[PDB]
CSV table of C-alpha atoms in Angstrom, one decimal:
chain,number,residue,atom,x,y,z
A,1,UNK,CA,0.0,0.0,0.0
A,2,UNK,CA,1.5,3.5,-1.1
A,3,UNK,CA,-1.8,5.7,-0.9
A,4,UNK,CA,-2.4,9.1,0.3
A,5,UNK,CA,-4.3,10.4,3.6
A,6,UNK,CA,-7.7,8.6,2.8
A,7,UNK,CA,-8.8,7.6,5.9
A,8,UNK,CA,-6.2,7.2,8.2
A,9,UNK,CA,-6.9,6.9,11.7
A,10,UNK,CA,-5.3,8.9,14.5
A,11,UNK,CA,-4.4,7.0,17.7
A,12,UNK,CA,-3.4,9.4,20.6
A,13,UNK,CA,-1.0,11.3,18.6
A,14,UNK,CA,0.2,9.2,15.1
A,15,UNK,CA,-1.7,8.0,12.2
A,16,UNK,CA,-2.5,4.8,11.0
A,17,UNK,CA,-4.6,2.8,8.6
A,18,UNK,CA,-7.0,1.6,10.5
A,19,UNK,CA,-7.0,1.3,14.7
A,20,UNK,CA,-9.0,-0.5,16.9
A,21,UNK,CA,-10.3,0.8,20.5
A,22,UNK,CA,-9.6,-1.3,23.1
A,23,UNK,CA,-11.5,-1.3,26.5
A,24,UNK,CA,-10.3,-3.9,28.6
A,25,UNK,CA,-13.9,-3.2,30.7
A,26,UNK,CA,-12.4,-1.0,33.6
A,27,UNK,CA,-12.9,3.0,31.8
A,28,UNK,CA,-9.4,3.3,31.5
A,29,UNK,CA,-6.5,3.4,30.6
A,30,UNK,CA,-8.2,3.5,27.3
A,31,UNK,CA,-6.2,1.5,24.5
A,32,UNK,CA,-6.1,1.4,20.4
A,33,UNK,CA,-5.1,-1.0,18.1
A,34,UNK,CA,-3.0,0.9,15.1
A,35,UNK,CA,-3.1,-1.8,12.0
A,36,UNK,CA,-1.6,-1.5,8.4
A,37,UNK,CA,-4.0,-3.3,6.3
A,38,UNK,CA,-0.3,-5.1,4.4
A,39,UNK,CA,0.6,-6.6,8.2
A,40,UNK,CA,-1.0,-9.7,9.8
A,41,UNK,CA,-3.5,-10.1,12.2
A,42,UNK,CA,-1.4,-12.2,14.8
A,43,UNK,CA,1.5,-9.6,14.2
A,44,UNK,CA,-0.3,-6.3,14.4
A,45,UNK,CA,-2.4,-7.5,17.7
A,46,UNK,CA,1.2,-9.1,19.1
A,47,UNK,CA,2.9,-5.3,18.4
A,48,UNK,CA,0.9,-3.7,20.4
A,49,UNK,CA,0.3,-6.7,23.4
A,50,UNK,CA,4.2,-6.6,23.6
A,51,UNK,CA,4.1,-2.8,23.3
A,52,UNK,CA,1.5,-2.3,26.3
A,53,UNK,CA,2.9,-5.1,27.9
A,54,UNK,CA,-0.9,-6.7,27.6
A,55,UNK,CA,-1.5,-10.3,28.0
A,56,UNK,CA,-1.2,-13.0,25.3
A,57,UNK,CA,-4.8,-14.2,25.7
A,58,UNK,CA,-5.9,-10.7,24.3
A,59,UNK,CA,-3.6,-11.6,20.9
A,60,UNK,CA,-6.8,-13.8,19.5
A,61,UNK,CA,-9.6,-10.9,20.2
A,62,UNK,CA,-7.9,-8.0,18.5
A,63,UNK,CA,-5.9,-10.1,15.8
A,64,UNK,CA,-8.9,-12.0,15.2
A,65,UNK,CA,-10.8,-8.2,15.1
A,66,UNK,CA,-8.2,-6.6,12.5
A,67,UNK,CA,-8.8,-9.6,10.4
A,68,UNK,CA,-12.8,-8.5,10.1
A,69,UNK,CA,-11.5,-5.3,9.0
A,70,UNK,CA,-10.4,-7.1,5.9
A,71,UNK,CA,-12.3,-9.7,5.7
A,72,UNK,CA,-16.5,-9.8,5.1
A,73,UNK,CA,-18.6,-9.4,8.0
A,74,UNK,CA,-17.3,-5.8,9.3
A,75,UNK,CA,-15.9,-5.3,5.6
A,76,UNK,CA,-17.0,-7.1,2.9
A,77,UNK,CA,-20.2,-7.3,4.8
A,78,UNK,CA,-21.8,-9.7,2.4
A,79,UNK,CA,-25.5,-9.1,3.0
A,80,UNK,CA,-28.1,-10.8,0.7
């Protein structure tokens, strides 16, 4: 991907493709979930659970949740 400022998302203070806001449940600290739609699920989620030093279990929900951003569903949708 080498595209322009289209919709870029904006977590606390740099820009991404797409992020992903993460409550744990507790209302704060409030997280996001910066993804680059040319990086992996498992990657991307395991970035930023290293990064914030959150735990592994939490790898599936928002690795599995950036995937949904590219695939149908939350995406593609696919609605008859």
């Amino acid at each position: 991907a080498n595209q322009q400022t289209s919709g870029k998302v904006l977590y606390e203070g740099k820009e991404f493709d797409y992020v992903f806001s993460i409550d744990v449940n507790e209302g704060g600290p409030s997280y996001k979930l910066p993804y680059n739609t040319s990086d992996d699920p498992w990657l991307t989620a395991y970035n930023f659970l290293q990064k914030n030093d959150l735990n592994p279990m939490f790898l599936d929900q928002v690795a599995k949740f950036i995937i949904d951003n590219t695939k149908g569903q939350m995406l593609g949708l696919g609605n008859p």
